[PDB]
Amino acid sequence: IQKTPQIQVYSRHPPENGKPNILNCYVTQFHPPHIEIQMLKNGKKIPKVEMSDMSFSKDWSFYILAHTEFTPTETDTYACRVKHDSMAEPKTVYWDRDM
């Protein structure tokens, strides 16, 4: 079976510019388990990215969380890019702090 990932980008706390926070990219409901996930700070790749909270749902779909510590700025734009066999080209999801 093959399922397309749902990608959700969000922070641990409500963003306060200049204040420390955790940016998470929760990729879910995908299959096969082969996947590449990158978190980008203004188009450039972030190094300090942790992989955690892996699990399967009732229907066996994979769930995985990518997260990093970050300090939001009014001008910096953050995003999460996912490459997976179920997609033609990599999908990029942007962090929308005004959500």
Binding site: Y26, D53, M54, D98
Partner: protein
Amino acid sequence: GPHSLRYFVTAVSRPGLGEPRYMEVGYVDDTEFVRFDSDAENPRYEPRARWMEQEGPEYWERETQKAKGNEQSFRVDLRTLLGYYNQSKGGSHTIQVISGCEVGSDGRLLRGYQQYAYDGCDYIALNEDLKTWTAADMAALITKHKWEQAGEAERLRAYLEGTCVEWLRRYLKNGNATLLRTDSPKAHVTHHSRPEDKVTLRCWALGFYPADITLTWQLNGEELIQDMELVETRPAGDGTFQKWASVVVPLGKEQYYTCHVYHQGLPEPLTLRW
């Protein structure tokens, strides 16, 4: 309240690209606490919780060797399955297993599980009785016979009611301060504009534990379920969870809607208005 020890196992082949990747991830309730990744630099069982550092060298070495044993065992299973299914050696394949036990407040096993899947589909699973197996297809029937002939359900019944339950007790003991805590959620409503003089009210619940929570929007009494959008509760990177539920309402009339947060960490449920 009840508690559980679950392990998510994955074996995924990579024909041509190398050896299969094997992973074992463990959870006590909603907390990840152990992991084994064969693609790691130095494949050892690692603690994913601060409290597991209380466990010494014998534990880590014992678990590491066991993980390596399972790894080698799944490499044999992957090939075996190609045959049961008449599959070519080229494709990549995945075997998943959920294994664990839930015990109630009194300490009696509420539920024990051992279920398998191949390529995202149910393959075989131990039944409620912890004595019989349910095979999902023609191929699974072969494993079922091999397992009946081996008295595998007995072996599992022993693990589930014995070992699983004892270790869960040791874990809850070693990490009670973390595992038995309760973080009440902090909620807030965000406003959002949109076409046709409509607005998006989004109720946010943040920093709570355990993961179970209930968020509902109400039109002064009625819970608007059908006309409410919401995400699956999700981990926030530091051991807590978050969630949100939104509802689109006519502009100027937002003050007739209330959000209600239900969670075990609260004396009374929360009620919020924009």
